[PDB]
Design an enzyme around this catalytic site. Structure first.
Site, PDB file in Angstrom:
ATOM      1  N   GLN A 100       0.743  -1.179  -0.156  1.00 45.20           N
ATOM      2  CA  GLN A 100      -0.204   0.153  -0.042  1.00 45.20           C
ATOM      3  C   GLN A 100       1.054   1.373   0.040  1.00 45.20           C
ATOM      4  OE1 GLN A 100      -2.148   1.790   3.409  1.00 45.20           O
ATOM      5  NE2 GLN A 100      -3.886   1.534   2.241  1.00 45.20           N
ATOM      6  N   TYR A 183      -6.067  10.898   3.680  1.00 48.56           N
ATOM      7  CA  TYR A 183      -4.611  11.028   3.452  1.00 48.56           C
ATOM      8  C   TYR A 183      -4.465  12.169   2.388  1.00 48.56           C
ATOM      9  CZ  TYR A 183      -3.736   8.174   7.519  1.00 48.56           C
ATOM     10  OH  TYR A 183      -3.943   7.767   8.757  1.00 48.56           O
ATOM     11  N   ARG A 230      -7.482   2.381  -2.941  1.00 48.98           N
ATOM     12  CA  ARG A 230      -8.286   2.196  -1.806  1.00 48.98           C
ATOM     13  C   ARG A 230      -9.061   3.665  -1.621  1.00 48.98           C
ATOM     14  NH1 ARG A 230      -8.049   0.305   4.429  1.00 48.98           N
ATOM     15  NH2 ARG A 230      -9.754  -1.260   4.120  1.00 48.98           N
ATOM     16  N   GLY A 319      -9.715  -6.799   8.901  1.00 47.90           N
ATOM     17  CA  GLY A 319      -8.672  -6.220   9.709  1.00 47.90           C
ATOM     18  C   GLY A 319      -8.380  -6.639  11.034  1.00 47.90           C
ATOM     19  N   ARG A 320      -8.955  -5.953  11.875  1.00 51.09           N
ATOM     20  CA  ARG A 320      -9.006  -6.433  13.498  1.00 51.09           C
ATOM     21  C   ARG A 320      -8.909  -7.896  13.848  1.00 51.09           C
ATOM     22  NH1 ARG A 320     -12.289  -1.183  15.158  1.00 51.09           N
ATOM     23  NH2 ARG A 320     -13.086  -1.305  12.842  1.00 51.09           N
TER      24      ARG A 320
END
Ligand SMILES: Cc1cc2nc3c(=O)[nH]c(=O)nc-3n(C[C@H](O)[C@H](O)[C@H](O)COP(=O)(O)O)c2cc1C
Ligand SMILES: O=Cc1ccc(O)cc1
Ligand SMILES: O=Cc1ccc(O)cc1
Length: 362
Positions: A100, A183, A230, A319-320
């Site tokens: 990424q 971002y 993404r 994810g988690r």
């Protein structure tokens, strides 16, 4: 029931084992000095190689693209070699892995970017957004960015293009452009974060220009079959808000579809920021973008299977749960109980809370 979730899928030149994705997750374990991907990270990713696809934690494309302490870079020879150790470890287990490519834009502090001032689409500071610093002290409020000049833009695109080449040299199967979670690119996309008066601001077409040019460069460098992107249409946790998210992102999806990027990854939830994501919106994205569609954010086995069977997603990221369950796929398939991760060891530190979560044992 999970049947579709465990069906393989073609991703460009790759044939993946299943529809499960280990989404990008910053763990800030990079070796100091130099922010180098290391051995514990290689073990970490290899432990989770039963995923159909692994997307690496965000990795900064330059010294000024970094936003948090100890995140791995992908611009120095050492960082490339460090990542190579990781991809080889992952490939030895039979799994595809994308890097990424990251540029935090305004979400950073001068301390994390060699005293330099953060850059962004505009001179707008992210509201109540903090980042971590050192090599440890702690969290600090982000600084005020300076608007990117045309030269800055050409430079960042250059840094993205080179990062893509470096990822291939590092053995990655492809790259994922981080244009989400508030971002740099997200800062151009969302209206309320972009107040430029030039060709990169104002209209929707102008707000998507930077994404368009960066992707153009990435594709030119390594091929569309190895480029993923993404986006985060509805979340706003890092300070980016759009006035008409549904329209902006449906457009973004159509734009990316023209570039024929291999996959579009939608970040549906960011921590506890889980906005209702209309099924109607998901169906529009499915029509706007014809490639492999990936979604991540609070999914469990049932919801993942249902998203695929309803025709909304091709792959689903967890994810988690992947942090605390290296053998997540096996657990999801059998319905084994999932361990929960420890927030205190998510970032920094060493192997504890990274590679010592055990596989399931009855
Ligand atoms: C510790 C941690 C670090 C993350 N870092 C990244 C990252 O570097 N890049 C990114 O795009 N998303 C990042 N994410 C977001 C995840 O990829 C994912 O979209 C999110 O956790 C929602 O999925 P979940 O509910 O299954 O955990 C991070 C999430 C966590 C828990
Ligand atoms: O606590 C350390 C830390 C490092 C990098 C971050 O991204 C967040 C936390
Ligand atoms: O918590 C760290 C983090 C980094 C990048 C993101 O996209 C989201 C979270």
């Amino acid at each position: 029931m999970t049947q579709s979730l465990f069906q393989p899928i073609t991703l460009g030149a790759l044939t993946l084992k299943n529809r499960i994705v280990m989404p990008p997750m910053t763990r800030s374990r990079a070796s100091q000095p130099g922010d180098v991907a290391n051995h514990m990270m290689a073990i970490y990713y290899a432990q989770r190689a039963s995923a159909g696809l692994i997307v690496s934690e965000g990795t900064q494309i330059s010294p000024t693209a970094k936003g948090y302490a100890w995140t791995p870079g992908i611009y120095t020879p050492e960082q490339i070699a460090g990542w190579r150790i990781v991809t080889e470890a992952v490939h030895a287990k039979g799994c595809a892995i994308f890097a990424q490519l990251w540029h935090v834009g305004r979400v950073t502090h001068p301390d994390n970017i060699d005293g330099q001032q953060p850059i962004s689409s505009s001179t707008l500071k992210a509201e109540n957004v903090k980042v971590f610093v050192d090599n440890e002290p702690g969290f600090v409020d982000v600084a005020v960015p300076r608007a990117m000049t045309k030269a800055d833009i050409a430079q960042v695109i250059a840094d993205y293009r080179q990062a893509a080449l470096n990822a291939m040299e590092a053995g990655f199967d492809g790259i994922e452009l981080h244009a989400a979670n508030g971002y740099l690119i997200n800062q151009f996309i969302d209206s309320e974060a972009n107040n430029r008066s030039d060709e990169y601001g104002g209209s929707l077409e102008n707000r998507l220009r930077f994404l368009d040019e960066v992707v153009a460069a990435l594709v030119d460098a390594i091929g569309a079959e190895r480029v993923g992107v993404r986006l985060a249409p509805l979340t706003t946790l890092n300070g980016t808000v759009d006035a008409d998210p549904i329209l902006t992102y449906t457009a973004a999806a159509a734009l990316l579809n023209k570039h024929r990027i291999v996959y579009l990854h939608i970040a549906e939830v960011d921590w506890d920021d889980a906005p209702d994501t209309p099924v109607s919106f998901k169906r529009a994205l499915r029509e706007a973008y014809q490639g492999v569609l990936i979604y991540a954010g609070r999914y469990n086995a049932e919801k993942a299977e249902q998203a695929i069977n309803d025709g909304l997603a091709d792959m689903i990221g967890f994810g988690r749960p992947f942090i605390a369950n290296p053998d997540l796929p096996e657990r999801l398939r059998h319905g084994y109980p999932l361990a929960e991760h420890v927030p205190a060891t998510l970032f920094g530190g060493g192997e504890k809370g990274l590679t010592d979560y055990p596989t399931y044992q009855a």
